C-alpha cells in the first residue's frame, strides 16, 4: 500500500485498474458515472480461496456481534507505527452498521470452513449523497478487514467485488468511502488533527511527544481547559430536537460539495445521544429556539504492547452546525465536554470549516491522510474545506 501520492505514482494497481474509478494520473473535468448501470447482475457469490466461506453476519445475535468485535479489535486499522489500533465497541458497531435502511446481506463476513473462525469482513450501508450538483442514492463502504494471518493473499479484492455485486443487486451503482491509503482516485484529501486533553497519558504512551522546548508542567498548563462549557443554553439533544437538528444540518450542509442528505429518521439515528457512542449538544437560546449544535462520537484505540496503559479514549468531531454561536465557541465547549467525559484526546479533520478553529484551539496536526473516494463517479477533486461528509 501507498500512504503518500509520491509512492502511489510509482505503484501499479492490478485490482483498481479493473474498477470503474478514474486513473490516478489523469485530471477529471467531467461529472457523471464512469460506466452505465448494469441491467443484469451476477447471481452467484465470487469464489473464495479453498477452505473459506461467505457468511452474512446477524449483528442482532450478541455472539456474532462479539465475533465481529474481536476480528476488528485484533485486525483492524493501526497507525503508521503499529502502536495504536481502533477498538470499535459492539454497541458502536450496531450504531454504525444498522442505520435506517440497513440490509443483512451487506454485513459480509468470511469464515474458515473447519473452525468457523471469522477472518474477513466488509460492510455497506445506504446513504443519499450530494456531490456537486447531483444527488445520488449510494452506499458507504466501511470496515473492510482481513485477518492478519490472511493478509497479502488478495482476499480484499474478493471482498470488494462481492459487496459490489450485493449492492448492484439492490439497484445501487455508486459508493463513497474513505481510506488512509492512496488509491485511484481521491475526490478529496483530508488530514486529522489532535487536541490533547490528557497530555501526561498521551506523552507516556507516545501518542504525542514532549516538545524539546517545553516542559511537562508547562505542557499541562498549555492544554488546561475550563471545568464547564461557556455557551448559554447548551444542553444534550433530546427527542423534541430531532426536527430542528435536521433543519439546521440540512441548511448548513448546502455550502459544501460532498455531503450526506439525511432523512429525519437518519438524523435521529446519527445524532440522538447514546452514552459511549455519540454525543450531541444543542444550543437552546433565551427564546427557546435551538440555533446551534455540536456532536462527537466515541472511538477508543488499543495501545499495543504497553504494560500499564491499555486503551486511548478518543472523541471524534462529527457534525457541528452554527448559526448564532461562533464555531470557535462551539468547539471550545466540545473540548470541555469531552474532557468532562474522560476523553484523552479530541480528533478532528480539516474538512468543512474546521481549519478556522484547529490552530486557535491548540490542535496539533496528525500524521498521514484520510482520502475520500467515490466509486463509479467522475467529478473534479475538491479541497478539504469543501468536503462535508464524516464517516464512522
Amino acid at each position: 500500500p501507498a500512504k503518500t501520492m509520491e509512492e502511489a505514482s510509482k505503484r501499479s494497481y492490478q485490482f483498481w485498474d479493473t474498477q470503474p474509478v478514474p486513473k490516478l494520473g489523469e485530471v477529471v473535468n467531467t461529472h457523471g458515472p464512469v460506466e452505465p448501470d448494469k441491467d443484469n447482475i451476477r447471481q452467484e457469490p465470487y469464489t473464495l480461496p479453498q477452505g473459506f466461506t461467505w457468511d452474512a453476519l446477524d449483528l442482532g445475535d450478541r455472539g456474532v456481534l462479539k465475533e465481529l468485535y474481536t476480528l476488528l479489535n485484533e485486525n483492524y486499522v493501526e497507525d503508521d507505527d503499529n502502536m495504536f489500533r481502533f477498538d470499535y465497541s459492539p454497541e458502536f458497531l450496531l450504531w454504525a452498521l444498522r442505520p435506517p435502511g440497513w440490509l443483512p446481506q451487506w454485513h459480509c463476513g468470511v469464515r474458515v470452513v473447519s473452525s468457523r473462525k471469522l477472518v474477513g469482513f466488509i460492510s455497506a450501508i445506504p446513504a443519499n449523497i450530494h456531490i456537486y450538483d447531483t444527488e445520488k442514492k449510494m452506499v458507504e463502504i466501511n470496515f473492510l478487514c482481513v485477518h492478519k494471518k490472511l493478509r497479502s493473499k488478495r482476499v480484499a479484492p474478493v471482498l470488494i467485488r462481492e459487496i459490489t455485486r450485493r449492492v448492484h443487486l439492490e439497484g445501487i451503482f455508486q459508493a463513497v468511502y474513505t481510506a488512509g491509503v492512496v488509491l485511484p482516485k481521491p475526490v478529496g484529501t483530508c488530514r486529522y488533527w489532535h487536541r490533547s486533553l490528557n497530555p501526561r497519558k498521551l506523552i507516556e504512551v507516545k501518542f504525542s511527544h514532549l516538545s524539546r522546548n517545553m516542559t511537562m508542567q508547562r505542557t499541562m498548563k498549555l492544554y488546561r481547559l475550563p471545568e464547564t462549557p461557556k455557551t448559554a443554553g447548551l444542553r444534550p439533544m433530546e427527542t423534541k430536537d430531532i426536527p430542528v437538528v435536521h433543519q439546521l444540518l440540512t441548511r448548513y450542509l448546502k455550502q459544501f460539495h460532498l455531503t450526506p442528505v439525511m432523512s429525519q429518521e437518519e438524523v435521529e439515528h446519527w445524532f440522538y445521544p447514546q452514552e459511549n457512542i455519540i454525543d450531541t449538544f444543542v444550543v437552546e437560546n433565551a427564546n427557546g429556539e435551538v440555533t446551534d449544535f455540536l456532536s462527537f462520537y466515541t472511538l477508543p484505540s488499543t495501545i499495543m504492547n504497553h504494560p500499564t496503559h491499555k486503551s486511548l479514549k478518543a472523541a471524534y468531531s462529527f457534525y457541528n452546525v452554527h448559526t448564532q454561536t461562533p464555531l470557535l465557541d462551539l468547539m471550545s465547549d466540545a473540548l470541555v465536554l469531552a474532557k468532562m467525559k474522560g476523553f484523552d484526546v479530541f480528533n478532528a479533520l480539516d474538512l468543512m470549516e474546521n481549519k478556522t478553529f484547529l490552530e486557535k484551539l491548540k490542535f496539533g496536526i496528525g500524521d498521514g491522510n484520510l482520502q475520500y473516494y467515490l466509486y463509479n463517479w467522475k467529478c473534479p477533486s475538491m479541497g478539504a474545506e469543501k468536503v462535508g461528509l464524516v464517516l464512522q
Binding site: 486499522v77 497507525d79 489500533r85 481502533f86 470496515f143 488530514r191 489532535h194 496539533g364 496536526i365
Partner: peptide
C-alpha cells in the same frame, strides 16, 4: 474506512 492518526 478510517485512518488511524497520531500526532506528527
Amino acid at each position: 474506512g478510517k485512518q488511524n492518526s497520531k500526532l506528527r
